[PDB]
């Protein structure tokens, strides 16, 4: 209600946090099936930072073309091209909790 809940203290992103936020946002009314944009991602990241305290530099993905995989192990959304730059859609994939696809595709990101 009021006053609006303020900025919470900073805390580092973890596998566990990314997984919980993933499952939270996969539920109906959340992130699933929305078309990606820089503005929409920034709005989401600000909301997560404000309300949960995770600095907004964790939701990065592998470069195109094709499916974009999350660089942060534990984040279970990928960006999937709508086949018709590419139009991308947020998609939850439960398998990403166990398979770090981005690292397999780009091990050079993780030295």
């Amino acid at each position: 209600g009021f006053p609006v809940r303020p900025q919470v203290p900073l805390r580092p992103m973890t596998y566990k946090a990314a997984l919980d936020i993933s499952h939270f946002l996969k539920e109906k009314g959340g992130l699933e099936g929305l078309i990606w944009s820089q503005r929409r991602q920034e709005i989401l990241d600000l909301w997560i930072y404000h309300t949960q305290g995770y600095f907004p530099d964790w939701q990065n993905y592998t470069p195109g073309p094709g499916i974009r995989y999350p660089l942060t192990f534990g984040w279970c959304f990928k960006l999937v091209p709508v086949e018709p730059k590419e139009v991308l859609v947020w998609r939850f994939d439960s398998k990403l909790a166990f398979h770090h696809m981005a690292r397999e595709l780009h091990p050079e990101y993780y030295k």
Binding site: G1, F2, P3, V4, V8, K16, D20, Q52
Partner: protein, 160 residues
């Protein structure tokens, strides 16, 4: 047992965090870092909470600038006592007032009183030109500059 009370609502997403509503009382279990482990008194549920969302229950209304239940007349008298300076002040009482020590080379020492109003959304204000989510923010604002008041706020009224 350290008991705190929530000033805001908090919705846990992390399975190790603790959700709460404004007014909920909690016992602090661990106090390392700015994320504290706590237990809800009502439900006994435990989890981590943002420490800036709560206040110690025994700390309530102990703000230096707050002067509980004292009249307009008494506020003037106390503020007008020697030892107080220009801009010395009080917040006194859901309905609050700001009393401020003023000076004028003709009238000498006086005290001005400002009604602190609240909006429907709960925001605090003296003027339509600025609004504050807490009384503390209002105090900090008028300590920076008079912004329409007779004086910039300096320090709380001296106790006697």
């Amino acid at each position: 047992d350290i008991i705190v009370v929530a000033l805001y609502d908090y919705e846990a997403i992390h399975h190790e965090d603790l959700s709460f509503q404004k007014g909920d009382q909690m016992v602090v279990l661990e106090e390392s870092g700015e994320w504290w482990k706590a237990r809800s008194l009502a439900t006994r549920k435990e989890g981590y909470i943002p420490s800036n969302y709560v206040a110690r229950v025994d700390s309530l209304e102990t703000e230096e600038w707050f002067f509980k239940g004292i009249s307009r007349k008494d506020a003037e008298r106390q503020l007008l006592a020697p030892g107080n300076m220009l801009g010395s002040f009080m917040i006194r009482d859901g309905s609050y007032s700001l009393s401020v020590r003023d000076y004028d080379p003709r009238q000498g020492d006086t005290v001005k009183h400002y009604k602190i109003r609240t909006l429907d959304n709960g925001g605090f204000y003296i003027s339509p030109r600025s609004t504050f989510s807490t009384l503390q923010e209002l105090v900090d604002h008028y300590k920076k500059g008079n912004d329409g008041l007779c004086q910039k706020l300096s320090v709380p009224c001296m106790l006697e």
